[PDB]
């Protein structure tokens, strides 16, 4: 047929709900053409398939409103035949539209609200929204490409994509750039060890699409229901959600970093972590007493390994229950944590969401009080839904209930009164259930058995979690499931603020869009494998683009047994995770830095030492994330979008604009090949911290670098200045040391950098102005600071070393504030000028040479 002449790559599936025969396909009013070898749909929509018609388009002060009408039913039940379209032109960068049922309030995700670069026009029949980039006329969105479906439990909205390059749609084990070859991406939070093609712990319905020439846009669908996102190679995308409404934001960039910042303007800028949170964290399942746990710190200390935060897993609890500690191995738990604090370290422990429900009445306050106050998710007969997790039978708190929030704050404060822990590791908050749904199964209804089930592991919404039709304060679990973790992270953030009075530190397994405003994330139960080491790079980068910059993987891997070589390379790379924790499973061989051979220990110690030297810089990068929606770890394409060679690179990463990390990610290698964008890149090993080229002069090219077992390649971009600080086994110690600058000159002698400094943990620092901020500038053989703000926290900072890279000629003299310096060295082979000074970050200085 004429209408069935649709190019293969542009066929949209008219049988996404079930296996179909040719006769049934045709009776739907669809085209049946088998592919010649999910894949390309054999049953697909002709361009005439019934959609909605636009009627009564009107122009308001905020934008546009219209009615959308479907005349012919779809093959799903409960089509909503009359919809309302609202288009809001919110800023020059942000376009917002919604499609709703004007006759019924439908579930919506709870969220605080925050010439243009876009234009918008509409197709009448079939209905579509078309968004152009005004500067070049590129079509960014065109929803005319397939029918709009809007049924009670099935929404589908499709669009063309501007290129084959698209990233986002966490959480999945994938390259940073997603495959457009008939790929079904499922968002349904699920406790499963990361494996390819699976819905994992978190769900972020946001994508960033690259455009030829290096501009980009982003799209956020504000919808928390179970969904599939289907990418096809035309290229095009289909959102398929199981409930809610279509609430769509388009972010115009044009730069990828701006797209990310614009997205974070809606969902929230990243929270500012405490400085100590950027130190090394060490944990395992199996530190089964305070004595053993104390030995970890002792063993790290004796072998000169920095450690800011000691953790415990389930070991601490009384019979694996929250807000208890056993009176055998952990009898003296309070004293252990007090002692940690006396030495300048912090303490973290695991908290699960589910609460043991099986104890005698009156014997377990978290449950007894939860029951009294009605804090738990309830079932059909109004009683707590009971599942099974680590303690046995458990009820599940409803973190959408304000009373549950108050209860959680209370349980956290009461436990903190016994043991003064410094944050919360919130696990199992998908929510995870070791049985299907509940001890009593689940009822048979349309929420438990919906007409479209996304491609979830196990083929049901109840698999490894609770019943979809269970009740929460705001809605059913069906609607709220993908928010469970997020809502717990918000509750825990608030609880920690109230209990401790300083910045919270929450690390969560499950996440949703906006998570980064409250908490960080670790990537869960990764294997100790070379595969998963390599896969951690794109995953950490992905979460940075999603505004969760406090992210990392379990260093050396969680599951199975690490090898020495793997743990060296994983420690080297993982020292560049913004959140750095080595964590290990119960039955695995030990993998603490001190448990390896001497050469391995040296390499691991070096990795940790370099991280601690860089902490002032890392902290400043977090400040930029927090105040301007920047990324901390970023892919090369975020920083060099106009170099199309960067677009598929995800085994290198940047810290901010200027530090390029090129890890070895394979066994047996003593070299690595990395992409170097146009520029001069100085080898960071030429900066004295306490055939290798000193500078890579790149045109935009791949470069093979020596990378023996003791080495990770780290390069500093010309034009940038990096603040550093002296060593310590903790940040309590390190923050008191002298600082240094590493100054990477351009060929013309230019560089710029910055330092942000506050007390490291107080609330409302920016609001109160309790911070110091300094800019550094190199120009014409001088280095100066520029004092943006100087306060008490910052006025003691001693600058004792200035290292200048790319100094072509040996200076005859070096001056600090007009006075010849006590000592400097120049190396003619590396072009490094190293200068001892006695200066203050917060007082104006001028260092010069000639
Ligand atoms: C809603 O959740 C409640 C729990 O909060 C469920 O209560 C459970 O109901 C089952 C029977 O439907 C009870 O099983 C019975 O146990 C007794 C011994 O204790 C035994 O003699 C019976 O033969 C039967 O096995 C179960 O004890 C009870 N759970 C608790 C903790 O009391 C209720 O069934 C749930 N409703 C729905 C519709 O799922
Ligand atoms: C598109 O809009 C027209 C006109 O709407 C007008 O009347 C409605 C009831 C409101 O008061 C609105 O503000 C007015 O602009 C709709 O056509 C009208 O529908 C009424 C109810 O069915 C009829 O009684 C009326 O005769 C008719 N008016 C005209 C001029 O045709 C039309 O239904 C609407 N289309 C859709 C799909 O909603
Ligand atoms: C948006 O997508 C639609 C559908 O792919 C495009 O509309 C088609 O345009 C061709 C000519 O290019 C016509 O022959 C068809 O009749 C149109 N189809 C439909 C269903 O209307 C449209 O061109 C796209 N718009 C933009 C601006 O790219
Ligand atoms: C801390 O280090 C000590 C010393 O290396 C470890 O103690 C040894 O443990 C092994 C068991 O694996 C014994 O064979 C040795 O005899 C022990 N030596 C001493 C001197 O006690 C200890 O296991 C380490 N603890 C932790 C928690 O890592
Ligand atoms: C992780 O290791 C433990 C213990 O392994 C023991 O035997 C092997 C062969 C080595 O020699 C170790 O040094 C020794 O301690 C195993 O019991 C466990 O199965 C293993 N895990 C996996 C996934 O293989
Ligand atoms: C660099 O400084 C010297 C004075 O110390 C001056 O002669 C020269 O013009 C300066 N260069 C520029 C570009 O300002
Ligand atoms: O995707 C291809 C599949 O489509 C289904 O709807 C058909 O029933 C199958 O025969 C076919 O293999
Ligand atoms: O179009 C019917 C079917 O065709 C084929 C595709 O692999 C499948 O995804 C689709 O459902
Ligand atoms: O608490 C026991 C285990 O629970 C989950 O599997 C966590 O992902 C893991 O890190 C932890 O060790």
Short mmCIF file of C-alpha atoms in Angstrom, two decimals, residues 257 576 614 617-618 621 624 630-636 638-640 652-662 675-684 687 696 713-724 742-746 750-754 805:
data_model
loop_
_atom_site.label_atom_id
_atom_site.label_comp_id
_atom_site.label_asym_id
_atom_site.label_seq_id
_atom_site.Cartn_x
_atom_site.Cartn_y
_atom_site.Cartn_z
CA UNK A 257 27.51 22.56 29.97
CA UNK A 576 39.40 10.58 40.66
CA UNK A 614 44.10 18.19 45.02
CA UNK A 617 40.61 22.18 43.85
CA UNK A 618 38.04 19.35 44.10
CA UNK A 621 34.77 22.30 41.74
CA UNK A 624 30.93 25.60 41.26
CA UNK A 630 28.48 22.82 36.77
CA UNK A 631 29.76 19.27 36.58
CA UNK A 632 32.69 18.06 38.72
CA UNK A 633 33.82 15.04 36.70
CA UNK A 634 32.98 15.70 33.04
CA UNK A 635 33.33 14.01 29.70
CA UNK A 636 35.68 15.52 27.16
CA UNK A 638 31.26 18.72 27.66
CA UNK A 639 34.41 20.77 27.62
CA UNK A 640 35.31 20.46 23.88
CA UNK A 652 38.92 9.42 29.92
CA UNK A 653 37.49 12.04 32.24
CA UNK A 654 38.06 15.62 33.20
CA UNK A 655 37.94 17.23 36.59
CA UNK A 656 36.47 20.62 35.72
CA UNK A 657 37.93 22.37 32.71
CA UNK A 658 41.60 21.61 33.19
CA UNK A 659 42.60 18.16 34.56
CA UNK A 660 42.59 15.26 32.10
CA UNK A 661 42.76 11.74 33.52
CA UNK A 662 43.62 8.88 31.17
CA UNK A 675 42.45 11.64 23.12
CA UNK A 676 44.08 15.05 23.68
CA UNK A 677 41.97 18.01 22.55
CA UNK A 678 43.72 20.93 20.83
CA UNK A 679 46.06 22.55 23.32
CA UNK A 680 49.15 22.05 25.40
CA UNK A 681 48.72 19.49 28.19
CA UNK A 682 51.38 19.36 30.89
CA UNK A 683 52.25 16.13 32.65
CA UNK A 684 51.18 16.60 36.30
CA UNK A 687 54.75 19.35 39.53
CA UNK A 696 51.83 17.13 25.07
CA UNK A 713 48.36 9.69 33.43
CA UNK A 714 47.11 13.03 34.61
CA UNK A 715 47.56 16.18 32.51
CA UNK A 716 46.98 19.84 33.28
CA UNK A 717 45.52 22.07 30.53
CA UNK A 718 47.60 25.16 29.59
CA UNK A 719 45.83 28.36 30.66
CA UNK A 720 44.80 27.05 34.11
CA UNK A 721 45.94 27.44 37.69
CA UNK A 722 45.18 24.74 40.30
CA UNK A 723 45.30 25.26 44.11
CA UNK A 724 46.90 22.42 46.10
CA UNK A 742 50.36 24.78 39.92
CA UNK A 743 50.38 27.35 37.09
CA UNK A 744 50.07 25.96 33.55
CA UNK A 745 51.10 28.72 31.15
CA UNK A 746 49.79 29.09 27.64
CA UNK A 750 48.54 33.29 30.40
CA UNK A 751 46.69 31.31 33.04
CA UNK A 752 43.69 31.65 35.36
CA UNK A 753 42.32 29.75 38.31
CA UNK A 754 40.42 30.01 41.53
CA UNK A 805 54.80 24.99 33.81
#
